[PDB]
Amino acid sequence: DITFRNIRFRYKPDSPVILDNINLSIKQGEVIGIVGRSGSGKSTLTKLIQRFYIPENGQVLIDGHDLALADPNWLRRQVGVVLQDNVLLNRSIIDNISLANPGMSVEKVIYAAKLAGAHDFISELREGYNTIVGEQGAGLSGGQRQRIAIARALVNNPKILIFDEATSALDYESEHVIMRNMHKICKGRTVIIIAHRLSTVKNADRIIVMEKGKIVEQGKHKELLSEPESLYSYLYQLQSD
Numbered sequence: 080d081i082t083f084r085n086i087r088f089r090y091k092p093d094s095p096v097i098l099d100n101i102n103l104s105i106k107q108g109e110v111i112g113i114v115g116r117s118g119s120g121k122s123t124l125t126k127l128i129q130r131f132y133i134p135e136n137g138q139v140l141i142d143g144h145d146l147a148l149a150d151p152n153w154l155r156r157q158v159g160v161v162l163q164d165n166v167l168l169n170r171s172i173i174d175n176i177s178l179a180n181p182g183m184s185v186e187k188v189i190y191a192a193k194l195a196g197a198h199d200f201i202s203e204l205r206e207g208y209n210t211i212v213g214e215q216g217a218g219l220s221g222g223q224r225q226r227i228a229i230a231r232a233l234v235n236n237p238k239i240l241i242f243d244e245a246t247s248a249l250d251y252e253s254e255h256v257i258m259r260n261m262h263k264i265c266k267g268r269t270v271i272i273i274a275h276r277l278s279t280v281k282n283a284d285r286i287i288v289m290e291k292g293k294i295v296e297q298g299k300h301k302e303l304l305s306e307p308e309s310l311y312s313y314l315y316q317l318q319s320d
Contacts (some may be wrong), residue, residue: 080104080105080106080107080141080142080143080269081104081105081128081139081140081141081239081269081271082103082104082105082139082140082141083101083102083103083104083124083127083137083139084102084137084138084139084140085100085101085102085136085137085138086098086100086101086102086127086134086136086137086138086139087099087100087101087134087135087136087137088120088123088127088132088134088135089135096135096292097120097123097292098120098123098292099292099293100137100293101120101137101292101293101294102294103287103294105269105271106269107269108267108268108269109269109270109284109285110265110269110270110272110282110283110284111270111271111272111283111284111285111286111287112271112272112273112274112279112280112281112283112285112286112287113271113272113273113274113280113286113287113289114273114274114275114277114280114286114287114288114289114311114314115288115289115290115314116290116314118290118291118292119289119290119291119292120289120291120292120293121273121289122243122244122273124243124271124273125160125162125241125243125271125273127139128141128146128158128239128241128271129154129158129160130146130147130149130151130154133147141154141157141158141239142157156235156237157237157238157239158237158239158240158241159232159233159235159237159239159240159241160232160240160241160243161228161229161232161240161241161242161243161245162228162243162244162245163225163243163244163245163246163247163248164224164225164228165221165224165225165248166224167212167214167219167224167227168212169211169212169213169214169215170211170212170213171206171208171209171210171211171212172201172204172207172208172209172210172212172217172227173185173188173208173209175212175227175231176188176191176192176227176230176231176234177231177234178231179231179234180234180235183234185208187234188208188230188234189208191230191231191233191234192208192230194230194233194260194263194264195226195227195229195230195233195260195264196226196229196256196257196259196260196264197223197226197227197229197230200223200226204217205217212227220253221248221249221253222246222249222252222253222254222256222257225245225246225249225253225257226257228245229245229257229264233264237268238267238268238269239268239269239270239271240264240265240268240269240270240271241270241271241272241273242270242271242272242273242274243273244273244274244275245257245272245274246258246274246276246279247274247275247276247279254276254279258279276318277311277314277315277318278318280300281300282300283299283300284299285297285298285299286298286299286300286303286311288303288309288310288311288314290310295310296309296310296311
């Protein structure tokens with residue numbers, strides 16, 4: 080259960096307030112989607128759930144524990160973060176996946192790759208998992224590199240997973256391939272999907288619409304879309320006009 084209590088955030092000491100007084104409570108296992116126009120403030124949630132951003136006021140807490148007092152590694156074992164990662168190291172495919180967990184089991188590498196939906200296209204290259212991804216000869220697709228990353232995050236078994244614009248730089252097809260796995264990737268996890276494309280968050284258990292640092296609307300895709308005058312309905316039309 081992730082919670083934002085009367086959160087207020089600024090980037091620098093005396094700059095504009097980005098998040099006014101956010102209050103949000105994400106239930107365990109809930110797959111929540113967060114959308115909004117430029118300036119909404121959604122681009123600060125990930126770094127706040129991690130503990131990079133420090134709230135000027137209020138508190139962020141996981142499972143009841145205030146993150147300002149939580150242990151760095153504990154917090155790191157709790158949250159898995161997937162950003163738009165289109166850069167790999169010139170190592171094997173498998174070394175790129177276990178980059179953070181050195182001598183981890185090949186069995187777990189495979190298990191993670193499977194969940195991420197990267198196993199098949201991987202065991203399809205010349206040398207498979209041992210294929211040198213040296214950004215020169217072994218050229219993968221953006222959608223594929225993005226999936227290698229989803230693997231890294233899933234290496235550990237994150238009870239909380241955050242996709243922050245993870246697929247915004249991909250075209251419909253590429254993203255689609257990935258959205259097909261989201262069901263199994265979400266199994267037994269609390270998931271936050273922050274995206275630009277409202278369609279990406281279409282089947283979330285609930286969508287949060289942010290605007291100007293504030294939460295203005297929230298509900299299931301269909302509830303929001305049934306209100307023609309809703310901001311969500313406006314944004315939805317825009318990505319299809």
